[PDB]
Structure 1
Amino acid sequence: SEIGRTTDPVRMYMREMGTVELLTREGEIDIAKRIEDGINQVQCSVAEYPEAITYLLEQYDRVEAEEARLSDLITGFVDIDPELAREKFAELRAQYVVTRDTIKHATAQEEILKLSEVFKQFRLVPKQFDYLVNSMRVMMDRVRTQERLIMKLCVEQCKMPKKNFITLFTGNETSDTWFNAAIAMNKPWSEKLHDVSEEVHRALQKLQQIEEETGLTIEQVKDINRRMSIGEAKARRAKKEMVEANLRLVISIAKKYTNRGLQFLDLIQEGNIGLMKAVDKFEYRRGYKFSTYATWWIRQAITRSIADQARTIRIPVHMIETINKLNRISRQMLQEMGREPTPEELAERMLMPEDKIRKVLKIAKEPISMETPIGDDEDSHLGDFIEDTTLELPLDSATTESLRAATHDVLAGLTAREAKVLRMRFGIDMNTDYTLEEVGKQFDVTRERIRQIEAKALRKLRHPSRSEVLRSFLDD
């Protein structure tokens, strides 16, 4: 189509963004219903893992003795007072204790779905719900890379048929009777394989703890993890359908922030991040349109990024808000008084001390480019008028070397002991100076004798016999 005719990233963004038609009032409701359907689907899948609801039950047991409050674990109930939640946790507890004692296998496979759809009633907070899902995630991910290294324990031995190797591995999972038929195959590969049949043992039996740790076996929670992925990827592509359809809301908001130190695309990217938060935190059951909430989050993200990354030397958000308040107060006083308000009267229009306002006024200036043309000459820039102030003048370098030579003369006009006491007492010809105790430990002498030595040496160097070379280094 129009592809290839522009390189501007903002034209490309707008062109690619406009291919998504907006949502109606009932479109947002459908998409939010799909999102919550995905998250309750992953809820009802993880309810198949019973240690999850035991964790939530012992969390309520923590709420029993005020380890937490109720608002931290449950945000509501669909089918907020502590009145209902007591019988709610009784409902989940009664289902758990009736599901515990049953071991069978079609007899014990409806009780789990009863558990899941009694647990569906809980509108969990993101904290606990995230905790359970990433917990079961890391559990089967470690045992799953364990299964994957059981497979690639054959690749170190040989290259092997996996399509013949998948028919064996599943379902026994407590023994090597699936591995016993591998030598009934006896193609060359399955020679090498069996010699590592010992170092697979500690792998192939250790998931046998989880075979009784969750109460389930690995193929059941395998399908549970698969339906977990289906549910969360269902919610993820539904949040994406609500983010992509409100990308013009971001632009309508972000055009109001344009020249405040950020490029247009920086603003709409930060607004996009805020919009993704707004989608994550939207409740359609409040009966409000998506624009009313999403505007709050988009405004937050955009103004926060302007506060953070629009200035070269960054000032905090508290000082950003103080500067904004000062500028608004000042443009009101300028309109009233008909002139610029002096910081003294600006200190009574605001209610801050006057030197605080003076330093706030000193803060706000932005650094000048060192390439600004001076007088718009464009052959003379600001940066070539800036001198290096850290250098020392070569007259001062010549003076320092002359002073070193003079000090060497004067200190050679002393005895070795006094010259050593002075060369250690100050840092002369050394990398460090020393205390009286360190110089005394160098001479196995207590500190006051070193002090006396150094005093008499300073007395000698003060004389008119040795000090006319040195006194010339003190400017009169």
Structure 2
Amino acid sequence: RVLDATQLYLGEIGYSPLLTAEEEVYFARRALRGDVASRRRMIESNLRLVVKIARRYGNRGLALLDLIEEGNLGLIRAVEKFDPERGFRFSTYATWWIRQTIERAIMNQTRTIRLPIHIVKELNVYLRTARELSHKLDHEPSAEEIAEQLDKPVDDVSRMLRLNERITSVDTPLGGDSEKALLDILADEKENGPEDTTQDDDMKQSIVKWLFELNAKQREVLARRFGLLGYEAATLEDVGREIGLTRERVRQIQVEGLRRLREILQTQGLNIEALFL
């Protein structure tokens, strides 16, 4: 029989009313006043019109079946707000809705990174201006060449072209043959390997040794300011909250702790060795 979801629906619309001028008015007049059955008919009837409009709006974002669904929602909003009293036909008024609802739904579900309408709307005029120029320049227009025709900013044109930059999936064959994908190459940013992990562990254990090698009040005041041993990274003025309660004596003792520690790095073999780093 038929096991394609496409042909099945396309069959069901093929057995649905095809309304006359005066028929549309009869149903529509009752549809506004809520006849229930009337709203269902006008809709069922003009599903055929939605498909013909979705035959041109394909190959842009979603599939043909995805365009019809959202194209049907436009016919529904057209039925929710049609004027039968006006002598003008329905097929005319409904087309404005079905073309709109489709374009809008493509603008959202086309890009992975959700691009709102404002940045997109403008991008189109920049691209459609590129058409005019390309045909008469016979040269794909630059960011400047587009900016000189619109008389608009350089960075705007450039930043709008940056958002046009599309994606390559991390699961995309490299070389058009089973070999390796981008995931088998692209490294992990967050976690750096043991060598970088042990750097900080060994560097920060060496400091725990260097602090117990300083003065009792010098490693208290120096550590609790930077937030090394304490809980919160305080300032020269804020070390007074603890027991210091001083502004001059805290600053002289902080730097006294650092000067004795600078000689501890000159002797152990760092100082200018670990200055490049």
Residue 368 (structure 1) aligned with residue 168 (structure 2): yes
Distance (whole Å) between structure 1 residues aligned to residue 25 and residue 264 of structure 2: 100
Q: Name the structure 2 match of 1:82.
A: none
SS in 1 for 2:183: helix
Distance (whole Å) between structure 1 residues aligned to residue 267 and residue 202 of structure 2: 14
Change (3 A) 1:468 1:286: farther
Q: Name the structure 1 match of 2:66.
A: 266
Q: Name the structure 2 match of 1:394.
A: 194
Please give the per-residue CA displacement for 1:284-338, whole angstroms capped at 9, x wherever unaligned.
Answer: 1111110111011111111111112211112221222222222222222222222
Correspondent of 1:17 among 9, 13, 16: 13
Q: Which runs of 5+ in 1 are unaligned?
A: 40-231
Q: Name the structure 1 match of 2:203.
A: 403
SS in 1 for 2:59: coil
Normalising by structure 2, what TM-score? 0.90
SS in 2 for 1:374: coil
Change (3 A) 1:368 1:465: closer
Change (3 A) 1:430 1:263: farther
Distance (whole Å) between structure 2 residues aligned to residue 260 and residue 466 of structure 1: 64
Please give the per-residue CA displacement for 1:194-217, whole angstroms capped at 9, x wherever unaligned.
Answer: xxxxxxxxxxxxxxxxxxxxxxxx
SS in 2 for 1:358: helix
Normalising by structure 1, what TM-score? 0.54
Aligned residues: 275
Calculate percent identity across the aligned residue pairs: 40
Please give the per-residue CA displacement for 1:160-217, whole angstroms capped at 9, x wherever unaligned.
Answer: xxxxxxxxxxxxxxxxxxxxxxxxxxxxxxxxxxxxxxxxxxxxxxxxxxxxxxxxxx
Distance (whole Å) between structure 2 residues aligned to residue 387 and residue 289 of structure 1: 61
Correspondent of 2:76 among 266, 273, 276: 276
Q: Name the structure 1 match of 2:275.
A: 474
User: Deviation of residue 467 (structure 1)?
Assistant: 4.0
User: Deviation of residue 425 (structure 1)?
Assistant: 1.2
Calculate the aligned-residue CA RMSD, in Å: 2.0
8 Å CA contact retained: 1:427, 1:433:
yes
Q: Name the structure 2 match of 1:358.
A: 158
Could you say which structure has the larger radius of gyration? 1
Q: Name the structure 1 match of 2:94.
A: 294
Please give the per-residue CA displacement for 1:66-105, whole angstroms capped at 9, x wherever unaligned.
Answer: xxxxxxxxxxxxxxxxxxxxxxxxxxxxxxxxxxxxxxxx
Q: Name the structure 2 match of 1:34.
A: 30
8 Å CA contact retained: 2:30, 2:38:
yes
User: Deviation of residue 449 (structure 1)?
Assistant: 2.4
Please give the per-residue CA displacement for 1:417-458, whole angstroms capped at 9, x wherever unaligned.
Answer: 111112211122344322345432221623332222212212
Higher relative contact order (CA 8 A, sep 6+): 1
Counterpart code for 2:275: L
Distance (whole Å) between structure 1 residues aligned to residue 214 and residue 266 of structure 2: 12
Counterpart code for 2:147: A
Pairing of 1:251-262 with structure 2 (within 5 A): 251-262=51-62
8 Å CA contact retained: 2:221, 2:244:
no
Pairing of 1:61-460 with structure 2 (within 5 A): 232=34, 235-443=35-243, 445-460=245-260
More helix by share: 1
Distance (whole Å) between structure 1 residues aligned to residue 138 and residue 128 of structure 2: 15
Distance (whole Å) between structure 2 residues aligned to residue 249 and residue 371 of structure 1: 39
User: Deviation of residue 21 (structure 1)?
Assistant: 2.4
